[PDB]
Amino acid sequence: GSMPPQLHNGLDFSAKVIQGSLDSLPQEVRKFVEGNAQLCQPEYIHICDGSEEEYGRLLAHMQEEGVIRKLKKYDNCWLALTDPRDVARIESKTVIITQEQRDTVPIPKSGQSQLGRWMSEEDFEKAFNARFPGCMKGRTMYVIPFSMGPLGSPLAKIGIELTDSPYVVASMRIMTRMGTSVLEALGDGEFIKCLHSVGCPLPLKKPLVNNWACNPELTLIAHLPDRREIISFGSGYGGNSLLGKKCFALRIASRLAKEEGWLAEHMLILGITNPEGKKKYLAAAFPSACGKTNLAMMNPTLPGWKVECVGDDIAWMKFDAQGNLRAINPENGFFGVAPGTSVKTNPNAIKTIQKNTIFTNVAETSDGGVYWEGIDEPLAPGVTITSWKNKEWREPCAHPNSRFCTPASQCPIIDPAWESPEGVPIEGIIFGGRRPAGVPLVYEALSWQHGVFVGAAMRSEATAKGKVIMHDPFAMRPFFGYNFGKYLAHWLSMAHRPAAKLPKIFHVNWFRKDKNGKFLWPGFGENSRVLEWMFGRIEGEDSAKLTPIGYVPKEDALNLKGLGDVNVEELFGISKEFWEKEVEEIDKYLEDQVNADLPYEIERELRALKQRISQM
Numbered sequence: 001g002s003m004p005p006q007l008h009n010g011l012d013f014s015a016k017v018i019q020g021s022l023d024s025l026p027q028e029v030r031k032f033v034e035g036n037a038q039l040c041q042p043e044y045i046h047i048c049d050g051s052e053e054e055y056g057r058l059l060a061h062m063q064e065e066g067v068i069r070k071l072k073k074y075d076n077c078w079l080a081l082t083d084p085r086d087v088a089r090i091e092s093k094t095v096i097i098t099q100e101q102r103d104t105v106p107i108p109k110s111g112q113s114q115l116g117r118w119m120s121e122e123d124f125e126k127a128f129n130a131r132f133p134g135c136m137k138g139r140t141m142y143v144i145p146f147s148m149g150p151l152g153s154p155l156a157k158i159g160i161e162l163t164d165s166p167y168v169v170a171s172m173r174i175m176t177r178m179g180t181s182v183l184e185a186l187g188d189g190e191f192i193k194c195l196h197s198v199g200c201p202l203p204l205k206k207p208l209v210n211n212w213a214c215n216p217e218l219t220l221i222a223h224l225p226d227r228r229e230i231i232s233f234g235s236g237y238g239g240n241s242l243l244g245k246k247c248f249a250l251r252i253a254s255r256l257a258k259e260e261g262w263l264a265e266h267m268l269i270l271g272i273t274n275p276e277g278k279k280k281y282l283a284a285a286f287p288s289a290c291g292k293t294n295l296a297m298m299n300p301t302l303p304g305w306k307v308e309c310v311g312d313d314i315a316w317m318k319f320d321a322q323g324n325l326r327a328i329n330p331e332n333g334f335f336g337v338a339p340g341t342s343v344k345t346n347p348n349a350i351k352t353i354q355k356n357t358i359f360t361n362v363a364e365t366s367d368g369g370v371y372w373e374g375i376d377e378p379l380a381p382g383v384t385i386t387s388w389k390n391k392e393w394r395e396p397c398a399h400p401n402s403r404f405c406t407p408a409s410q411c412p413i414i415d416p417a418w419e420s421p422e423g424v425p426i427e428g429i430i431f432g433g434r435r436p437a438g439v440p441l442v443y444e445a446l447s448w449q450h451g452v453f454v455g456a457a458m459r460s461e462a463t464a465k466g467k468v469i470m471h472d473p474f475a476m477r478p479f480f481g482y483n484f485g486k487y488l489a490h491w492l493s494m495a496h497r498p499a500a501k502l503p504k505i506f507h508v509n510w511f512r513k514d515k516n517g518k519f520l521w522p523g524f525g526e527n528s529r530v531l532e533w534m535f536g537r538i539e540g541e542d543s544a545k546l547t548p549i550g551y552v553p554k555e556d557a558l559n560l561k562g563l564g565d566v567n568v569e570e571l572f573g574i575s576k577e578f579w580e581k582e583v584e585e586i587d588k589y590l591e592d593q594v595n596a597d598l599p600y601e602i603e604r605e606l607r608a609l610k611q612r613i614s615q616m
């Protein structure tokens with residue numbers, strides 16, 4: 001873009017650019033970069049090109065400043081350890097700004113909304129002014145041009161993230177498509193404006209802990225959908241700082257999707273091929289605490305079946321002119337929870353993460369390897385462990401929210417269409433939650449409307465003493481870009497869309513325990529048997545029986561060959577007393593939390609379920 005006019009010498013930042021050119025940027029890109037540079041006062045501006053050279057040098061530099069360590073056991077893998085105050089998304093400091101609160105969250109009947117956090121426009125200007133002026137003093141402002149989705153896909157959308165964190169740059173290179181080709185594709189078009197800062201201008205006013213710059217007290221993750229802006233301050237943690245992911249691809253994206261006729265959801269996408277050489281794509285939404293990544297990369301136990309991964313976290317879906325629900329994975333990598341990852345739980349992840357992968361808050365072995373709880377692999381004596389707190393270890397060795405951040409292209413079961421610009425046709429949508437009692441292994445919704453209800457009704461046992469069953473509709477509770485009632489209405493409207501081929505909707509539960517606490521289902525790759533049943537159902541097979549909660553596998557329909565005796569009686573048991581309570585808790589929840597914005601059809605599904613249960 002062109003040089004700003006000025007009476008002095010404070011507005012044109014061209015002389016501080018150390019890679020790239022303000023002149024070569026599209027006009028609105030320069031205005032976004034230069035205006036924030038005027039505000040944040042970085043020492044330098046680096047316009048990222050996405051090259052391997054850039055990446056390699058940025059890593060080595062972080063290595064030089066003690067901010068990351070090379071993991072010598074592996075091929076180009078790296079470890080970051082954070083300030084223990086900056087380890088996770090902070091929901092209570094995550095907000096969406098709109099003129100009217102009701103556009104962002106429903107106004108609850110009696111309680112506080114659990115479905116979002118609204119902040120007023122005026123409150124946010126004050127909060128911004130108290131954080132961003134001068135915040136990058138002494139630092140480089142990196143400019144990251146990025147695409148969500150395959151470059152050029154009709155479903156893809158472009159952002160520009162400004163950040164003062166090299167860690168965010170490196171991770172965005174993995175988790176998005178980043179660099180010069182994006183700028184060239186963008187041209188004079190529109191882009192989501194993403195501004196991030198760790199909130200630690202130099203000279204530092206407060207102690208730097210573990211060489212991890214952050215500002216926990218002023219952490220604030222804000223979304224301004226009307227301005228097409230995401231503005232995030234004080235956290236380097238991925239869900240807070242990698243703005244393409246939750247901020248853009250769920251919060252901003254879900255609101256855009258509502259307005260444009262598509263869906264942005266917290267779903268994995270997998271492709272499954274059966275022994276008859278037929279392949280289907282499925283999407284699944286489980287709470288953050290559950291195992292999307294494991295299901296998306298499942299190694300099936302059933303012979304002749306194959307599972308391939310399109311994505312493990314976020315799906316962008318649009319019914320096309322032909323009525324097919326086409327989906328893309330808008331991301332470029334996997335930002336997976338490391339603990340619990342083993343050759344038994346996810347052998348394909350184990351394979352993926354030994355090259356070109358950045359790990360955060362895991363333990364390090366003395367031979368330059370990684371360790372965490374649940375890795376389920378012994379260490380040779382001699383090999384010692386440094387914890388994620390940078391101390392010798394024999395409390396966990398890795399933070400429970402520690403991560404790997406790995407390229408999608410490296411997954412040995414990555415689907416051949418995982419980057420196809422047209423997306424993949426979704427034929428089933430799976431909801432699920434961790435339920436120790438009452439809820440069967442699998443059931444199928446009676447209708448589209450019943451299925452949307454099933455999404456809305458999702459509950460799951462929270463990670464621990466005492467247990468709590470929390471609501472998490474569509475697995476979107478932390479992620480709604482707008483009023484949940486209106487999101488319900490948007491999903492319900494798909495039934496009325498000309499030509500739409502509405503996928504079958506299922507609900508799963510791998511967690512049911514019997515009368516004495518015994519797991520009723522062995523899980524892992526045996527979950528391929530559930531996927532088999534769903535596959536058949538989608539093909540029209542007569543393999544279901546009706547129950548009050550929906551369809552379940554009829555007698556002998558579920559493939560149990562090789563498993564022995566399975567207590568299907570208890571696993572598929574439906575208790576009237578459990579379901580009476582369940583429907584009441586769902587009622588109370590929807591009435592309070594959705595209130596005047598609850599669609600008629602969802603109230604009707606509630607009444608119908610109540611009625612079916614009453615007739616048991």
Ligand SMILES: [O]C(=O)C1=N[C]=[C]C2=[C@]13S[C@@]23[S]
Binds near residue numbers: 286290460509
């Ligand atoms: O089990 C368990 O855990 C399960 N199932 C189904 C679905 C989902 C889960 S977790 C989540 S989160």
Ligand SMILES: O=C(O)c1ncccc1S
Binds near residue numbers: 239287288336
């Ligand atoms: O909380 C989430 O669902 C999540 N999913 C993937 C990667 C990071 C996060 S913060």
Ligand SMILES: [Mn+2]
Binds near residue numbers: 266288313
């Ligand atoms: Mn997620």
Ligand SMILES: [Mn+2]
Binds near residue numbers: 492495496601
């Ligand atoms: Mn309708």
Ligand code: NA
Binds near residue numbers: 067210
């Ligand atoms: Na560190």
